[model samples]
Target: KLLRAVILGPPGSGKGTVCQRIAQNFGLQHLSSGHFLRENIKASTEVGEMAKQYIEKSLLVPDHVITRLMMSELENRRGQHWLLDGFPRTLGQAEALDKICEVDLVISLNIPFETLKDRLSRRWIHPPSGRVYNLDFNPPHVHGIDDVTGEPLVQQEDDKPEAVAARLRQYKDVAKPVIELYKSRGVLHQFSGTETNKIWPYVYTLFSNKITPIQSKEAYL
Candidate 1:
């Protein structure tokens, strides 16, 4: 009845930014499973209360508990337009999702490793103006200089290239089985790019073609 979707992307992928754009233009509620998880824990719902033990003693709240929690939550949102984030990070979660609803499309991101590392690390900013630039996305007309301000852009110690090494591992091999499942179903659509602005147009087009109810899909043509 509506666009039920999931997005898979590595760290530094700009997935969240694009997801927000899709939700804004198409009117789907963008949801993060993690956000809802903590929400229930704060509200002391049964699932969260029970899940709290696992988070305290073990880690990650376990798959079955989270699966049960989100499955119920998704069922409650019946007849709603939603884009899911960071759920089904496991095969069981994917199966759990499949049992309740048919996902219309799954978006996978395939950005190169160096690109992700560079994006995560190479951010330079003007401290006074809060203007930021990525050396990869668009280097200034003169390197490392803010064009208008003509000042040096500074890099944070926290964002060093080596500092980001831990964060940029081929994200979510744990979810690969689920990815394979969706790939088998032929609903998985993947996009490859280094920057958000470039990849987003085709994604916007895809969403327009699929999510729009035949108003017109200049996107598809």
Candidate 2:
């Protein structure tokens, strides 16, 4: 059986780390919308060009554009166990996604505002490769440099404290209805904490009960 999961969280909430762990343990395909968009942008695809305009302005990508990109990808993954991150940001998008397939589970991360603010402010990224580094938790070997490349890393304009606050506020406004929609469908699971490592055990336990871990048959022997 294919298990479909969606993870929702504000910026700096450690959704990426948690999603990576879940995909590794459960043998599920991890689809991150941000990464998908970045890939397209790097390739200069039509949708990528469209998304780039908004991204350059630090504005949210329009719903129809994002919906088209996500739906096209979902159509090709009909038989796979997959987890989606950073796609649906509004009630309209969620309703559109429902037309394609039913989500088996939804996980939401709730971290305190101050913690999120501090975390985002210190975040830096290698824009070309999209490798993120956090000053507090994860830093590069050399200051302001990408670990893989000698290129300098940059802090996104949106990661500034002022912009982070605005982004979080906008997310909360749109996400309330999306969360309610999933909650009404009885698939919403919420995790609250400041650190990914601290919150992962509970998430791990929940997934353990829901899906069998993927392991090699030789391991059983």
Candidate 3:
């Protein structure tokens, strides 16, 4: 059996940061939907071009497209532990994934919406290496500069305050019911906090409920 987990959170909830830590610590493959989509576009594959068309028009790609990407990736890692982020954004996709694999846990990071909007609006990124820096929380080593290459970071247009607010609204409308669906199954565990420092303890506790913990590690169960 695989120790599969799903990490769910709205935009700017530090899902990426937490997921990275989880993957590094637990040896889980971090399958991120946004990165998967971008990889498709970067590779200029058929699916990439198709998804690009919808993205250019600010349209949502159908669940099937995302499902295909996920299923293909999951198939290649049939027996390994893994964590999925930014996936199954809808009930349909949730159902679709369920048909192919059994998910052991679903971890929802329930950061306050106001906090998320503020954090997201201030988020900047170094596009080439996908290094994310935030103004309020984890600022870069240098003001507006990438720590590694010394290149200036860029704040994405979508991270503008107005855009962040709108995206949060859209996610709420779509995600609440999807989460509710999981809750009904008694599998959705929520960990809420305003910052990563505050949230990690709760996340550690959740993991401790299911696995053995090593002396140096926070939690595992």
Candidate 4:
């Protein structure tokens, strides 16, 4: 049986970092919705083409479209243990997911707004590789440069203070019911903190007690 999990967090809440740790320690496939969509768009698949139309117009992709895309991917993964990130952004999507398979756990991060704002504002990225760096936590080897290629790093417009705040506000508005749904299902686990490192230990402990550890060969190889 697959050990399926989902993670919920606002932008800059360390979902990516925590998800990575969970996948590594738990031997699960790390399925990031944003990355999956980007991969599809890059490949120009049919669904990707449909998503591109909405994206080009700066419109939100419909819930059904996202559900269809994510469901197809999950179906293909059948028995693999998996951790889903950046998905089920709405109650509708969560419902759709519920129809497929039982989710073993749902993790939500409760990062402070000021902390999220500061973290996002300090974020920089390498455009070509999508490698992220934060000035406060994970800075590059050289200031303003990509550590590997020595290329200039750029801050995304969305990472600007105003944009980050707006995104967080929107996320909370949309995510409230989804969080509630999981909570009522008795699977929601919330971790609150200002830093990823500080929150990780508690998360790790939770997994240690609740999940069986299987060392991942794929992670090492």
Look at candidate 1 and tell me the lDDT of residue 51: 78
TM-score of 1: 0.73
If scored against the real structure, what TM-score would every candidate get? Answer: 0.73, 0.70, 0.70, 0.73
Candidate 1 residue pairs in clash (backbone atoms < 3 Å): none
Candidate with more favorable, higher TM-score: 1 or 3: 1
Q: Candidate 3: deviation at residue 210, Å?
A: 3.6
Candidate 4 C-alpha lDDT tens digits along 1-221: 56677888887577788778777888767897777789899999999999999888867877788888999998888777778887888999999888889987888887887777776778899999999998878999999999999999999997887887787788899999999999998988888776656777766666666678675544332
Model 1 misplaced stretches (Cα beyond 4 Å): 121-172, 213-221
Best by lDDT: 4
Error of 3 at 96 (Å): 0.5
Question: Could you give the C-alpha RMSD of every candidate to the true structure, in order shown?
Answer: 5.4, 6.1, 5.8, 5.2
Error of 2 at 172 (Å): 0.6
In angstroms, the error of model 1 at 114 is: 2.0
Q: Which stretches of candidate 4 lie over 4 Å from their true place?
A: 57-60, 117-166, 214-221
Worst 10 residues of 4 by lDDT: 212-221
lDDT of 2 by residue, 46-86 (tens): 89998999878868887788888788778988988778876
Model 3 residue runs over 4 Å out of place are 42-44, 56-60, 114-167, 194-196, 211-221
Cα lDDT for residue 8, candidate 4: 87
How far out, in Å, is residue 92 in model 2?
1.1
Between 1 and 2, whose TM-score is larger? 1
lDDT, each prediction? 0.76, 0.81, 0.78, 0.82
Model 3 agreement with the true structure over 1-221: per-residue lDDT tens digits: 56667888886577787777666656566798778889898999888898999888868877788888888778888878767887888888898888878777888887776776675777889999999997877999999899999998998887777887788788888898879988988888887666656676676566556654444543332
Q: What lDDT tens digits, residue by residue, belong to model 1 across residues 46-71?
A: 99898788888887677787788888
Clashing pairs for predicted structure model 2, backbone only: none
